[PDB]
Amino acid sequence: TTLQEKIIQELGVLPTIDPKEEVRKSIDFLKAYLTKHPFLKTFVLGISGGQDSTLAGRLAQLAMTEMREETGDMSYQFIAIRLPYGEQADEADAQAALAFIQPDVSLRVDIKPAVDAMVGSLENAGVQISDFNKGNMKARQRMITQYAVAGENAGAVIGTDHAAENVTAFFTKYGDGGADILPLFRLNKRQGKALLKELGAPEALYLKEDDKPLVADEVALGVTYDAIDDYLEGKKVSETDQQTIENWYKKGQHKRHLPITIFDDFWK
Amino acid sequence: MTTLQEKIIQELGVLPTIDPKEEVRKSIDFLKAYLTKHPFLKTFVLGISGGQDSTLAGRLAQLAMTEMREETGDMSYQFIAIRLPYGEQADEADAQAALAFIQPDVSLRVDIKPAVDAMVGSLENAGVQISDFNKGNMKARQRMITQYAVAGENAGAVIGTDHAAENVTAFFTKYGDGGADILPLFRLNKRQGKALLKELGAPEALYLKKPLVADEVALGVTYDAIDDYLEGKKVSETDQQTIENWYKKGQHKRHLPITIFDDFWK
Numbered sequence: 001t002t003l004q005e006k007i008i009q010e011l012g013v014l015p016t017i018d019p020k021e022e023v024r025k026s027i028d029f030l031k032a033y034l035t036k037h038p039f040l041k042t043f044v045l046g047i048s049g050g051q052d053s054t055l056a057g058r059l060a061q062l063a064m065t066e067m068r069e070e071t072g073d074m075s076y077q078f079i080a081i082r083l084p085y086g087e088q089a090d091e092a093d094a095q096a097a098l099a100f101i102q103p104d105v106s107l108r109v110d111i112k113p114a115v116d117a118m119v120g121s122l123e124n125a126g127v128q129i130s131d132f133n134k135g136n137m138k139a140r141q142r143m144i145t146q147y148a149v150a151g152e153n154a155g156a157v158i159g160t161d162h163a164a165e166n167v168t169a170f171f172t173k174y175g176d177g178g179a180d181i182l183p184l185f186r187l188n189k190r191q192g193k194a195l196l197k198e199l200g201a202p203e204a205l206y207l208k209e210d211d212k213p214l215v216a217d218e219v220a221l222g223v224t225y226d227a228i229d230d231y232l233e234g235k236k237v238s239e240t241d242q243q244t245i246e247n248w249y250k251k252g253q254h255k256r257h258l259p260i261t262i263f264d265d266f267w268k
Numbered sequence: 269m270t271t272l273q274e275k276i277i278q279e280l281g282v283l284p285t286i287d288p289k290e291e292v293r294k295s296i297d298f299l300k301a302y303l304t305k306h307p308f309l310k311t312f313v314l315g316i317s318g319g320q321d322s323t324l325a326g327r328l329a330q331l332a333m334t335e336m337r338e339e340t341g342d343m344s345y346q347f348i349a350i351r352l353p354y355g356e357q358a359d360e361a362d363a364q365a366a367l368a369f370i371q372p373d374v375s376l377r378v379d380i381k382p383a384v385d386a387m388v389g390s391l392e393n394a395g396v397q398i399s400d401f402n403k404g405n406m407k408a409r410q411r412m413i414t415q416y417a418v419a420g421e422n423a424g425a426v427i428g429t430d431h432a433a434e435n436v437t438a439f440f441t442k443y444g445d446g447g448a449d450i451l452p453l454f455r456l457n458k459r460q461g462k463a464l465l466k467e468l469g470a471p472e473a474l475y476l477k478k479p480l481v482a483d484e485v486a487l488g489v490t491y492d493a494i495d496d497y498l499e500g501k502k503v504s505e506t507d508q509q510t511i512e513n514w515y516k517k518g519q520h521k522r523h524l525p526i527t528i529f530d531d532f533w534k
């Protein structure tokens with residue numbers, strides 16, 4: 001077996017899916033977890049306006065709607081949290097997703113006071129935080145907010161990690177990677193778009209002739225989501241793009257595992 | 269068929285008897301071997317509170333960095349210790365005695381209370397009251413953010429203090445003090461942690477000490493019973509039930525976020 005075949009097996013990506021069936025697989029998986037853990041009543045997720053948190057939010061809300069209808073228990077709710085950095089941050093994209101999700105609870109918590117206070121307390125010790133590190137600080141502060149809300153409403157924190165993000169470890173360790181359950185895990189980027197299309201999401205929520213332009217995530221990675229998805233579907237990509245993808249994989253192995261103990265061997 | 273006690277001991281890798289001198293080497297060599305395999309890592313980062321776990325983990329990381337410098341001649345290999353108090357009223361005497369024994373390369377002090385209080389204010393601003401217990405987990409996560417911020421600036425890895433006696437009961441905050449990069453103490457119980465601290469020449473005020481300890485009061489079971497359990501001995505039916513109940517409740521803390529492919533929760 002090759003590294004590509006192994007990575008595909010590890011992430012459980014299928015070269016082709018049934019988007020209608022995958023939506024049911026995602027929802028039934030969520031519902032099955034609630035039933036086995038009666039102490040869990042709510043689902044919490046930060047809604048950023050992006051494809052991932054929109055799809056994971058809709059699947060979470062659809063799960064809770066079925067739960068409270070099957071069980072009659074009205075405690076089953078999904079809580080959406082808008083987590084802007086600052087008070088003049090554009091939230092048009094976020095509430096466009098909110099209109100599609102239709103969450104039972106819609107909250108807004110500004111993370112700028114906490115992040116700025118933590119940055120200041122760090123500068124008080126000679127630690128100046130770079131621009132990119134501050135981004136990781138924002139993702140971890142958003143992790144704290146979602147877990148603070150779940151810690152009050154007997155909830156579980158939904159995670160937006162999927163296959164295309166996991167190969168590249170394109171997430172903040174214990175930031176957006178810090179969550180309780182992963183409804184999107186197994187799907188690549190374009191497969192996530194297919195599920196959003198299956199759920200009747202307005203086309204402006206996953207998209208935005210000549211070549212398609214690049215998004216911020218692809219500029220950082222040096223490889224497009226189409227190559228990443230082709231790779232995870234078992235298709236042959238260029239030697240250059242394959243090297244980029246597998247380099248990100250080995251680079252982010254520590255994010256794909258629990259904290260490293262003396263018994264681990266994956267890193268050697 | 270194998271007991272749950274045997275599975276847990278195998279899973280956590282506890283030994284009924286250890287060699288404290290050898291176990292000191294096994295942790296130091298493990299930390300150095302990871303740095304050697306990852307030349308982009310140059311520092312270790314750990315919050316120092318004064319307790320047994322962070323003191324033993326801090327000394328082991330500091331010792332490993334000293335050997336790293338002497339073997340390679342690269343002076344950038346440093347251990348960074350951060351005092352992470354909540355406010356000013358918090359007593360510093362116990363954390364100070366830990367730093368006197370560790371003698372770190374870099375000693376920082378970051379107060380998490382401004383960030384934590386701002387988080388609470390923004391949450392209460394949205395109608396979310398925060399209880400004292402939920403606020404406790406928020407402090408452990410804010411401390412995690414501080415440590416990873418320092419590590420993100422210094423090409424560092426965050427040292428974790430989780431051990432066997434803490435993993436059975438899952439007595440840590442998910443992505444709080446449980447969020448770390450490398451666990452030098454994983455396999456040791458609570459008393460084995462004391463034994464290594466003795467081997468390392470730590471003063472007895474750091475690990476020796478009927479009075480009530482806060483951990484055992486919340487856990488409903490003593491550390492001596494947890495350590496007897498992890499050493500393969502037989503414990504009372506009451507204590508065995510208490511421990512195994514914590515183990516099943518904290519299974520989600522011992523695994524990555526749940527995917528559709530997992531079955532341990534079923």
Ligand SMILES: NC(=O)c1ccc[n+]([C@@H]2O[C@H](COP(=O)([O-])OP(=O)(O)OC[C@H]3O[C@@H](n4cnc5c(N)ncnc54)[C@H](O)[C@@H]3O)[C@@H](O)[C@H]2O)c1
Nearest residue numbers: 132136170171172173220254306416419420424425426449
């Ligand atoms: N140029 C960019 O666009 C850019 C820059 C920085 C970060 N990001 C994004 O932030 C997120 C994470 O980036 P990040 O990795 O820089 O921050 P991160 O906090 O998620 O990961 C780095 C941390 O993990 C630990 N670590 C690093 N190497 C380790 C190793 N071999 N073993 C064990 N622990 C190790 C360290 O504690 C380090 O601080 C991603 O989504 C990334 O796309 C993007």
Ligand SMILES: NC(=O)c1ccc[n+]([C@@H]2O[C@H](COP(=O)([O-])OP(=O)(O)OC[C@H]3O[C@@H](n4cnc5c(N)ncnc54)[C@H](O)[C@@H]3O)[C@@H](O)[C@H]2O)c1
Nearest residue numbers: 037150151155156157180401405438439440441442486520
């Ligand atoms: N009386 C006390 O002394 C006391 C009380 C509470 C907490 N604590 C301390 O805080 C530490 C953390 O414990 P905690 O549970 O209160 O906070 P925690 O954040 O570590 O665990 C609770 C969170 O984990 C998630 N979760 C809970 N059950 C889950 C499940 N079955 N599946 C998936 N996710 C689940 C939820 O997001 C929940 O909000 C404790 O170990 C203890 O050290 C002490």
